[model samples]
Target chain A: NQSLHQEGFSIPLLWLQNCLIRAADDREESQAVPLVPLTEENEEAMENEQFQQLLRKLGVRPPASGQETFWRIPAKLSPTQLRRAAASL
Target chain B: NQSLHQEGFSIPLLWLQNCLIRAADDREEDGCSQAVPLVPLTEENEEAMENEQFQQLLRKLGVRPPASGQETFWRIPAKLSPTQLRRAAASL
Candidate 1:
């Protein structure tokens, strides 16, 4: 329990992306964007243009080629985006 | 350091409200709400109860009041307040 708290917490980036997109859609503010699936071929998903667009909307910029073990909402997102994401969670 | 991390982090409700409002205003989503100030009250600045309204919003969403006395910061807890948080965000 102590180590768990010290280690902090994280959510997968793709999971958050899907939620945020869903939240935006709920508000009728989104124009029907594709959602990033939680379990997909990393390389294949990353290459999908619609998936790339969704990442941009969420302010995520993953590095060239590998998956991150744990993820967080990008720190520098505008408050609106951050708030919307939080609402999704 | 371990003790501090175990204790966790907190942010004043007023501070977060002000930031969230500003974020909304920047995106033209806010219809003008007064900002809660960080400074102690003085004679010159006595017309803001935005903090109270924020608390009401939380209440309406069913968020619990802080259990840590009157200190401004709300302590962050793991796996606590997810329903409260989700509801709060939905309203926004």
Candidate 2:
């Protein structure tokens, strides 16, 4: 016998948006493409306060908004510098 | 490096012909929807020998020719009552 069904799941939209931004940056750098900033309207779309509160209740880190460079060179930077950059978010 | 190429192959037409005949029989007895027969002489202008043979050799099985009510049970009875129908072509 064959059957079909549907299911639902939840995740932090902020984290996903941040991950997308980071991935796009890495791809651009790898391919020698220029960085493109998210427009003001796009930023507003991600600024869902209620969703951010829900994510906080679930113990998930809300993604940092704004443009972050995709590519990273860890070996060139010291541990302190890396921590500082991450903390600045 | 990436390369694109084309190749050709061949197959036994008779064996494929037999397989299509068997599959059609199975579908009919299961009380399922009958398989659609190929329209060889339709406005598509397909030649029976060329299209059917090409299909069979290229591993494309032509749809079985439609059977009359009496011929429906021909192949099944051949398998179940082999002694009664000795001719191989009788089933077909």
- The C-alpha stretches of model 1 lying farther than 4 A from their native spots are A1-14, A17-38, A41-44, A64-72, A78-80, A85-89, B1-92
- How does each model score on TM-score? 0.22, 0.17
TM (chain A) per model: 0.34, 0.23
Docking class of 1: incorrect
DockQ of 1: 0.01
Q: What's the DockQ for every one of the candidates?
A: 0.01, 0.01
What's the DockQ of model 2?
0.01
Residues B1-92, candidate 2: write the lDDT tens digits. 00101111112223334445554455545444343322222212122223433334322222333243211111222122222222221333
For residues B9-54, write the lDDT of model 1, one tens digit per residue: 1133333344444434443433433322233132111112124554
Candidate 2 lDDT over residue span A1-89, tens digit each? 00100111122233333543454445444322211213323222234444334324323343222222111222333334334332323
Estimate the Cα RMSD of every predicted model relative to the unseen true structure: 19.1, 22.2
Error of 2 at A43 (Å): 41
